[PDB]
Ligand binder design. Structure first.
Ligand SMILES: NC(=O)c1ccc[n+]([C@@H]2O[C@H](COP(=O)([O-])OP(=O)(O)OC[C@H]3O[C@@H](n4cnc5c(N)ncnc54)[C@H](O)[C@@H]3O)[C@@H](O)[C@H]2O)c1
Ligand SMILES: NC(=O)c1ccc[n+]([C@@H]2O[C@H](COP(=O)([O-])OP(=O)(O)OC[C@H]3O[C@@H](n4cnc5c(N)ncnc54)[C@H](O)[C@@H]3O)[C@@H](O)[C@H]2O)c1
Lengths: 481, 478
């Protein structure tokens, strides 16, 4: 049963000001879970004012010493650990991802990120700066203020926690809008946040839609900082709204056309295993997903053959079943877009190696699909599919594949598979990607920054670098008489 | 009697006429005469310069091949040249802006040299991290150059505001397209000659003069510019950042205006607080991003601060920028002059007390007492010689009133009391907080705005975060 469905302001639950509610549905059963309060600008304003009050100098939250902000973040992680089974179940109901993946990947990431950043609270350190004989000059990394977080539906809790953890450890307060498709875990986190003993108004949560709640957050004159995870087009709008309002600081985590490069000297079975996971994890609906699998011609045919085997053997079905590795797509909209891209694949001349249609009708499941013979100007090679489709391209030289890998407007991640030291490091430095994996895929750490080059994002999440998004530099310069 | 040698577009260390053939005049604001004509760039010329900057940034280019310490040697070479032609640069700055020659020589150009030398020493000290993860994993970060950087700068400190951008951008290994303000293009163009003489490879720095809505807009929306740095008005800063986001999501640094407060406590050195508040308000005819717009004085020293301020204001010399004695030259443009006098009149009509000045001779140094928060002279950036003096009672009170602005560039506090100094420094929402001084800038100290006064920071180690892109390399060992 879903207990938390309301708007969370000042550690209180609230009906929307309009009284309106919206439904969240289970993609696997195709049935409606519950209804959630549908917020709007009046609700954002009530949340922002709360966050402002909790942020005023002299408030309890601003009076906490640094280590007690740490201790609270550990207390949050501890409760998320206690109710892990329940949070992973709610994520599965909302997203369709396999329960065991939500438990061991999503929730594990949530706990690790919170503990990591908990330990940053009392180590956020500015500088003392040598100037003149009679001057004392130093800098302070102060909290930036009221922070908005807007997150997508593919990793609903994790993308929020990547925001909540650095922001709170730096002493900010927050307004959160989860995706309208996936509100359930955010709202649950809220009960845990009040249980952890965060003062009222430090974290507020307003569900609802993008053009209503989201745009009101990005345009709010008393929000100082916004962090957004989602599509490139909405991120442009969000940064535009931020600039037309009060010039709030913006972190953008956007899409990518992520390349995956398999050299002739790769461990081929490792490359196949990693490229398969990198394409198909979370039903393909992952910002890190491999959209272009470049395979050098010496192992092209054997890579394809081994990839078709993995794809034909990947279990698809009920996400609450131990055996499932692939649940359903998120909703009818995405389901249709993926099938249209598959058809363009066939129509544009790519060789269909397996799958390529719905799995059994009635459900939002798509057969895992592999295309070979894919070229750069094909649609399946140029567009984010957000579905279980592995397009495999061929290349000849390192220099050639660097150019084809970089000739995109995106740059979130890349992966290289080679046994050669020079090749690995030549590619790591030349690929214009925020993360370059070498002989691995989807290797994320709370302590390693993540984010995009070019139109894949602004700023970083995770690692010490996340702290720079959540703090404002102040120079204090004292002249001694 | 100085001749202007450089009037053309600078691309690939070559001088170019504009694609259109159009030119624009730049005028001495003190003689009111026309100095020369400058090539007027537009979108075609920007495209040409962005292509030069990309060819220069391509992997394997001479610029990308230089070792880190050679980038520093080149910046030091550019400082030696600027230092050599210091008098010539300051002269051009005086002709273009009207500020006194000695001010250009010992403030602007001095800051240009210091900033260049400072960031020269950063070039081989830009360091990423090695990050502990798992027993079988090698995770590190590279602080890579962003790529092609646009710089858009205003008329009040032309060269200095360019150099605050060029110095960290080159030292991190980017390439650049520079647009100086249309009113003040002369020292940018001359710096281009020294960039070539210093030996920067062609295309590393390109300069296109011209206007905001033509050249500046072509820069901020250009699909192959990776980064933009802007100094100017809040309103144009908002447009630049929006154009940047609408095109290709290029990274954007903004240094904008502010409603900068001074705060004078009862236990201040009053003569120090008077001298500094006077300099802050009246320096450069008030046309400085750091200018003081609100002077808060505790009631115990309020009337005496006003008296000494009035005397201090009545002695500052105003006149010809080429004369040794002048501390205040002319203003740049007609529009400010008129609105200053309108604000002066709103001050009278809203109940402020005019203590001195309040009319043209450009404008008499003016002091208002009995100013309150809701008055216009306390709420609007004046950017002219007007000293509004407000009264306060408690530290907590003046914190609220100083912070109830949408801005936050600088602030200055005057007090002999350790606790007061430090409580105010922590509590003020300002990117710089001066205690017992004013206009104390350092190439090693970051500078930049809280709130609507800016995004990002210039100067100091923090400047380097604006000109690098963080890459994570994660290697799993078998
Ligand atoms: N522009 C839209 O709202 C819209 C409409 C139809 C389809 N889509 C597509 O459907 C997919 C949705 O997946 P996603 O969640 O990763 O992408 P997304 O970028 O649409 O959504 C991410 C988050 O941003 C919010 N958001 C949406 N519009 C916003 C706005 N105008 N201002 C502020 N916040 C806003 C959403 O509510 C959600 O919380 C994407 O492919 C997207 O392009 C988007
Ligand atoms: C007018 O405005 C002046 C303000 O002075 P300032 O130079 O400090 O402020 P400003 O913000 O008007 O100009 C700063 C710089 O931005 C440029 N710019 C102006 N509009 C632009 C636009 N739409 N897109 C891109 N760049 C643009 C200018 O040409 C200049 O180089 C007054 O002095 C008066 O002349």
């Amino acid at each position: 049963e879903v207990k938390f469905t309301k708007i969370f302001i000042n550690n209180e639950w609230h009906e929307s000001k309009s009284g309106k509610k919206f439904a969240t549905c289970n993609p696997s059963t195709r049935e409606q879970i519950c209804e959630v309060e549908e917020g709007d600008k009046p609700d954002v304003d009530k949340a922002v004012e709360a966050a402002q009050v909790a942020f005023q100098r002299g408030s309890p939250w601003r009076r906490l010493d640094a280590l007690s902000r740490g201790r609270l973040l550990h207390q949050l992680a501890d409760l998320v650990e206690r109710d892990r089974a329940t949070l992973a179940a709610l994520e599965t109901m909302d997203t369709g991802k396999p329960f065991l993946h939500a438990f061991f990947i999503d929730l594990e990431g949530c706990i690790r990120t919170l503990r990591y950043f908990a330990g940053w609270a009392d180590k956020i350190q500015g500088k003392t700066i040598p100037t003149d004989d009679n001057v004392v000059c130093f800098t302070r990394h102060e909290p930036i203020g009221v922070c908005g977080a807007i997150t997508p539906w593919n990793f609903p809790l994790l993308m929020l926690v990547w925001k909540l953890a650095p922001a709170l450890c730096c002493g900010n307060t927050m307004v959160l809008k989860p995706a309208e498709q996936t509100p359930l875990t955010a709202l649950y986190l809220g009960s845990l946040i009040k249980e952890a003993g965060f003062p009222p108004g430090v974290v507020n949560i307003v569900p609802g839609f993008g053009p209503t709640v989201g745009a009101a957050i990005s345009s709010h004159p008393q929000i100082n900082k916004i962090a957004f995870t989602g599509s490139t087009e909405v991120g442009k709008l969000v940064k535009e709204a931020a600039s037309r309002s009060n010039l709030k600081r913006v972190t953008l985590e956007l899409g990518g056309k992520n390349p995956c490069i398999v050299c002739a000297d790769a461990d081929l079975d490792l490359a196949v295993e990693c490229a398969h996971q990198g394409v198909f994890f979370n039903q393909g609906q992952c910002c890190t997903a491999a959209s272009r699998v470049f395979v050098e011609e010496q192992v092209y045919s054997e890579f394809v053959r081994r990839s078709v085997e993995y794809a034909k053997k990947r279990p698809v079905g009920d996400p609450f079943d131990v055996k499932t590795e692939q649940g359903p797509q998120i909703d009818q909209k995405q389901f249709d877009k993926i099938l249209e891209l598959i058809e363009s694949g066939k129509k544009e001349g790519a060789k269909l190696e397996c799958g390529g249609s719905a799995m059994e009708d009635k459900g939002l499941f798509i057969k895992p699909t592999v295309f070979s013979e894919v070229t750069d100007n094909m649609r399946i090679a140029k567009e984010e599919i957000f579905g279980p489709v592995q397009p495999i391209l061929k290349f000849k030289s390192i220099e050639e594949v660097i150019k084809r890998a970089n000739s995109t407007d995106y740059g979130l991640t890349a992966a290289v598979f080679t046994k050669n030291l020079d090749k690995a490091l030549k590619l790591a430095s030349a690929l214009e990607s925020g993360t370059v994996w070498i002989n691995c895929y989807n290797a994320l750490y709370a302590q390693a920054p993540f984010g995009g080059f070019k139109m894949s994002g602004n700023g970083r999440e995770l690692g010490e670098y996340a702290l720079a998004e959540y703090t404002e530099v102040k120079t204090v310069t004292i002249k001694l008489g």
